[PDB]
Amino acid sequence: SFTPANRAYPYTRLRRNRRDDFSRRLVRENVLTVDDLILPVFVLDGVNQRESIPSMPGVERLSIDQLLIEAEEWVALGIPALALFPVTPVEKKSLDAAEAYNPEGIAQRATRALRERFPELGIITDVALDPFTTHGQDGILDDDGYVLNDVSIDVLVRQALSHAEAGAQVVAPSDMMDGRIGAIREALESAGHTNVRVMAYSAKYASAYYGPFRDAVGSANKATYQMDPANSDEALHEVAADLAEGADMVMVKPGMPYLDIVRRVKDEFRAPTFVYQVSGEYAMHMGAIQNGWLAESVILESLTAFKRAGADGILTYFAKQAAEQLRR
Amino acid sequence: FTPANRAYPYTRLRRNRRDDFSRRLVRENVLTVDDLILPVFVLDGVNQRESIPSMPGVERLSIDQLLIEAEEWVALGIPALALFPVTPVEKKSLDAAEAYNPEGIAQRATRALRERFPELGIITDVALDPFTTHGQDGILDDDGYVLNDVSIDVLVRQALSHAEAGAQVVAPSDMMDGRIGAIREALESAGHTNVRVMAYSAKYASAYYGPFRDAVGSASNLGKGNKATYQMDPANSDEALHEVAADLAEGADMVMVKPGMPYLDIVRRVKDEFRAPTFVYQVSGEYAMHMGAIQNGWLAESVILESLTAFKRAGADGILTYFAKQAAEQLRR
Amino acid sequence: FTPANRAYPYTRLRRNRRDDFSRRLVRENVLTVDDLILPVFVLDGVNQRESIPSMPGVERLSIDQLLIEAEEWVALGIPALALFPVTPVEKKSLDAAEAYNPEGIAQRATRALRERFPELGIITDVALDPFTTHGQDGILDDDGYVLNDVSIDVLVRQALSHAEAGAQVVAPSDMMDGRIGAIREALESAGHTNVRVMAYSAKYASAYYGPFRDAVGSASNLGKGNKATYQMDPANSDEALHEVAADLAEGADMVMVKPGMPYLDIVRRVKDEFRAPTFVYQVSGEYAMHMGAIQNGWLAESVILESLTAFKRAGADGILTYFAKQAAEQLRR
Amino acid sequence: SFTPANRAYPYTRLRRNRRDDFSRRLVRENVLTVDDLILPVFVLDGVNQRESIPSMPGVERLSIDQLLIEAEEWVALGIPALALFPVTPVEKKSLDAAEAYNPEGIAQRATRALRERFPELGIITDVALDPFTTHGQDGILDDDGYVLNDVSIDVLVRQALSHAEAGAQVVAPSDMMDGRIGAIREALESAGHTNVRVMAYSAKYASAYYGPFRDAVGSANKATYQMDPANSDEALHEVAADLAEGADMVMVKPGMPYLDIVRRVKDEFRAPTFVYQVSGEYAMHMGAIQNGWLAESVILESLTAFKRAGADGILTYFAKQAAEQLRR
Amino acid sequence: FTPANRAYPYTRLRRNRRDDFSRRLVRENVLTVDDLILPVFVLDGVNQRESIPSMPGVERLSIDQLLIEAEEWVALGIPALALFPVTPVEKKSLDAAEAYNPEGIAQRATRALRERFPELGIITDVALDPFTTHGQDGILDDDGYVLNDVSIDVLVRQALSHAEAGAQVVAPSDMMDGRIGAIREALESAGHTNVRVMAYSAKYASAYYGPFRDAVGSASNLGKGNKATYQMDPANSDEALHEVAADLAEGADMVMVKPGMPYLDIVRRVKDEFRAPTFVYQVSGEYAMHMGAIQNGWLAESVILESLTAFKRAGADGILTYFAKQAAEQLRR
């Protein structure tokens, strides 16, 4: 609620608290810390390998050995968690997305390796069929090319179970099938994975901002499962279902173009609330900074926005650069 | 909000997403051309057009060229322009006198447009930053601090001069405390009964204004200077409601949040709490980052309408956007 | 709040508690050094340091010693000090004239600090209790009652003298009705445009101020006297909202609850209803009880940060705390 | 909600009602009475025994015969209920916490004795494994030393049933296992203990304020079941679950450092709401009073705080001293 | 309110009802003697006591007898009396001049009580109905309508006279628009800084005042007259919030609902919306109906405390009740 309390110029001058650095610090409503940051990482199949991504300047795909080397620095910076995104070899893609639950799939191998080397580092796996399907569709298709809901869930459940077996502390379904959070929850509980967190992509929109991601993972209609950008009330129904179904955290994706959604979600549910600053937001920002059009300070500014809007944690490709700025 | 015990599989939220016709029926918000305001950079002189490297596709234009281009903006149905003059270097001063010159660029441009296109809205910029040698939004004391009340005296003269030139809307972008009331009191006194005041109510001390400062040429004046003693801390949300409340008490006809996309949560809170006409500026840095990504082939041209739909969804009534023409074109077609 | 039908075993709230990394991600509030204000007891004279038996570890300091100690407070990043002068006995009077002496301890200390540490916030104490022979916060009528409006006249002189000495913030701790408005009107008139007024809005007639009254030396003056005709009844919560509402209407830049931990529910209500910068005093008695338990080995040193985290969680923007240095040290390390 | 109603100085002078004792009494919002008070008591195994506790000055551990003697005075003062805390002999501690449900365990014996002698006195037993485990962990441990949730619940249920058999009118689970209120409720109902109250420790924090208690009971990580002190929204989810699960009362612990939590709980749920002024709060206050740093009046002041914040009842080591002050 | 999915048999609300100790723990409200105000009918003369047939057990008393009885009211801890004078017939007039007579019964009684019992609260009645020949609460125009502003002029004189006699609280029971502000402005001007104003804010045009009109002797004056042009329509609830809002804006220290039990829903709305000190009058008709039933053996004496507990539960801070002594006796024992 809001009560203006009859405040009026000149008795009230809001510039007074702005006058000095010390008073600005005292009244500052929100601060970003490294504990708000999650780093998404693109993981290759090989050894001794890194690759640059044309539409995501400065982001590398890394083989698992290279991932372990870089995680030393991420852990030193205090980054609490990584979000793993495998770059599936084309030979391993299929109509049935079976690679999703392969015990020696990239995500499963990367998870085992990280859990052993850095036991305190959070590993959030991606529960999703798009990296494993022949054309990059987000699930199993019917004769009309429609992504079947419940049949896709069956595969997502096997995948989530395989991640839990590999040691993942958090599984993060990014698929937008109806009811999948509940299905995954019933399977994790039945299997005795009682502490495995489910970070639901609850209000994920049918967005043009995912363009560069598809270059990153090598996966390059969605309006039949991802949300219409026009819709806000609908996001509340999505999150309400996911919390009833057992999610430990709920996410809004994309991020900055949906800050109003972050605010409403946090205000209405008062649950742990996450947001993804996606590949397109990263690319636009990094592009402008590299062109000398925007100052490097826009990085923190965009991240501060998430905190102010109500987010508990941010999946961001800027995580390491932000961590280094926060530290010094 | 009441969830009403809705539960899978009785409730499957993909059912409404199944077909175009049903997505359309349930669609919560739609952008139209009546939501669009085009900011324009206005040069002195005749037959002048200048590219802006940090705003690819945007041109500074002399008044003659402005009048020509406005034919298609009007044909597109764009309801209003926000004018931003590019002050010649020699007209910048300590006292910012050029702000209220009846022969200033902003004043000349307003008279020309009001005569040529009587139905087109003209929103003038009330601000001293285009006219100061230091590039700060007001008059400095001997410590280099921007004096609040003394700066308002100049802003008042400026707003009065815009009303005299025929501007239907004056928009104070300065972030002085109390200037909405001061300007409103001056307009009323002078008989400018229906001149609208579009307050920049919750304008943040942001890094996203870089390309604009290049465009109007205040970048070299400002140098490394900042506006943290008047523009708002990016961290602060509750404070925005206090800013808006005062501007409404002071007589604003419209209230605005700036920047736009990095502050959509502020747009939402402001529309929810006050239920007043609420405006948002998609600023130069926002424009530049989208255009850069599009020209690189990193983002599809559809992001333009996606970014604008967000403002509508968040609660905005109108959007100042350098994409206005491209958007109106795409909405028309 | 909507529970969203969450139910065991689908919802197990221990899952987020399982690992340090996930506890960290979901952590709702974190104390930083920018939340801390250090109250300091200031003696007259030179090279003076005095222990306080009821506040183990806290020293009264002369200005010279204050300036030395402040080097490490600034190095620690502590944003502000709240100054509390220890008035010599012979300077106490019926009329509390010493309150506005330009050569009073508070005034001398402010000038010295503002010159030495220009970025350090100085919050002065607007109050007559250090200066009266009876120890009450104002001027007595012939029934021994603290006169409201006549006391304000003195508080106004005092606040003006602090502004003249350079104090960025004046903090009226007196609990006279209407004094925020009176002081604000005086500051504005005199041109002190940006001097902040941190109102002690909801200050309770509490027993937890004992050690402070010892520290500043008002204990012997007050004797068995009480402040129930001005400070608030501990029983009353709704009344705090009326106190805050008035202080905001009167121009306060910040509003404060005192004491702190025994009144966390008041902090919560005040931040929830007004959404204004909200401050809380962890008072001398609170300090003393924690330090006593720690020195006895009854409570671990971690209670310090636990007690301060509570203020943040409850809604406080800033905390006046005698633990500021120990806390800043522990946050730094 | 709040409406300021345009009240303004000098028309409004809030000191007017403060002018006189009579008007202060008329407008006084909250009062503490003895019916708000619950006395926690430390119960020894022997006969003819009392012991002092170094970190809780003035508090005695008492054998059951001594407990019955002292309860005469507590009953005379009108104290409605005791909260029993057994001091387990070290020979009776085990990995399996079996002493928790022993029909002749201290708590069970004390309960039978009190129920017979003072039939109108409320007896609130502590449902908890920490007094009965070899090292004082709050439940049954896995190989990694993690407190297993559901397996601990099994023992807590047997304990709660044994308390109900002994005659306890209220059982009070202080363990912070997920779902235990529901488990205890299903067992009490199945067993025909239909009027046995469950007072849930709903929002119990991982606190440094419990130090002296561990000296009192002879039990001297918790962040994996007790709440992070930083978290407020989370307390609402905890209480919502406990009410759905069948709790008759909900509690916040510790007390004064969490008054904001008391306020939110009472405001949101409007259910019987309890608060524990824990051993550390008692010790700090009593210490300062004994040192001559704080006046005895801080006792009432701290207790009045609970009432004002929304608490229906307070577990306090000051109960008897407060009862004597309230009476005269 | 959130039901939190509570469901039989997991939730059995009789469990807390099972034992006295648990009912006590969960008990939401408890009446104490500090909630009680005793209205008293005061006669002229010496050694006068008169029974009231319609208020069985209540006596009109001369000042001397009042002073004697007050010894036990004070011993019982009753915080305040509300004085109601029984004006001699010959002192009633068109102009209600007796209202402000310094030697009126109300004024004499106040002086006597303030001297004898300095800690006892005295609430005087600001109203013209005891003093008019027609029995209406003010001055009539030539159509027989009660003039609003002209009546306030008299009420102001009356309130001033009560403040002069030493009354700590004046209570305007007249229901003129704006009289709270008028009286407050007069008190402030004259230096009566701390005289409380207990507004009868939402006082209904009720039939339950019959026995009171007999008690003070205004019944024969009023005859068949009604007060529907000033007292509120019994049908109206929303209107009460507008009445209260104005009285608070005008400076009331306490707001009151009258009658009491037939208007408990109004007590609840008023306390919920404003969170101010809220008072309720258990009127003469309410007293009479309870006492009649008790004396008939139709209702047990326990209804007295039940009826008073209701006011507390509904949100009242204090209750004017002719049962004050019987209640204080029963609470004491």
Add this chain to the structure above:
Amino acid sequence: SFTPANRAYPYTRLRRNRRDDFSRRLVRENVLTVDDLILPVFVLDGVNQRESIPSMPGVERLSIDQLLIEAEEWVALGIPALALFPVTPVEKKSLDAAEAYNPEGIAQRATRALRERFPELGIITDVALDPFTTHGQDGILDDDGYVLNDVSIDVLVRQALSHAEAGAQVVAPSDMMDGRIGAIREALESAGHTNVRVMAYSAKYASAYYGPFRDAVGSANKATYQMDPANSDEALHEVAADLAEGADMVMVKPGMPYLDIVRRVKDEFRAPTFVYQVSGEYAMHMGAIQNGWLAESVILESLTAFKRAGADGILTYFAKQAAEQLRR
């Protein structure tokens, strides 16, 4: 919600609308009509019989033939419903309350008679064991004299079914057993009584105002099932359960001493909300009117109070007198 809208004297003068009868009528917020009225009636076992009740002046007990004669007038006045209260012969009272479900019990006979003669008249039967138990206890007793919850429900269900069989359109459980609304609902549905309304006595208080009723029915502790008069929040939990359990209407009893409860119930649930102006409220009012202490107008005034507080219907012994005043 409430917004004062800065209204201020003298621009705002609330007496303006009060100036004239016409403007008072236009702005009048609530009106009582006969459709708000329910008449409770005391029904005797015999023929050709009426009896006066000492503590309820002007109220008669009536045999069924006399009830049918009087109902002609009640129906002519437009009174929508009667609430039947049998006066059980002492020979028919028992420990097991079997008379409660007797097909030829007074309530069942009265119901059949009225349903046949006046098919449009609402008949609300009382579901309750107190008229049928040996000493007037509100249910079946254990060895300690405690009213057993679930075992009493079994009898209440058989009674409710017998009322439904007799033709009653509404059954009204006045017992305050936990969960009885649900039990009665499951039985009515199973038995095919799908349109039988259940009017729950949801927030019924342990009150002294029931004194004269006990004289009326010949039935002359309750704190273990009826609510503590001190408790308001608790009434919300009571009504929430009864609506979840299937009640078509919810009631607050007693009436005028609980108008705040009526207001909260209607505000929070927005469901059909009833209130009982009980025998003690009737007696106090009628007593004062007969003594010449209060004018007859207090009857309407008290009834108007119910409407204003949020009640949809009022059980009142004044129903006929009020109906005649409303008509003319």
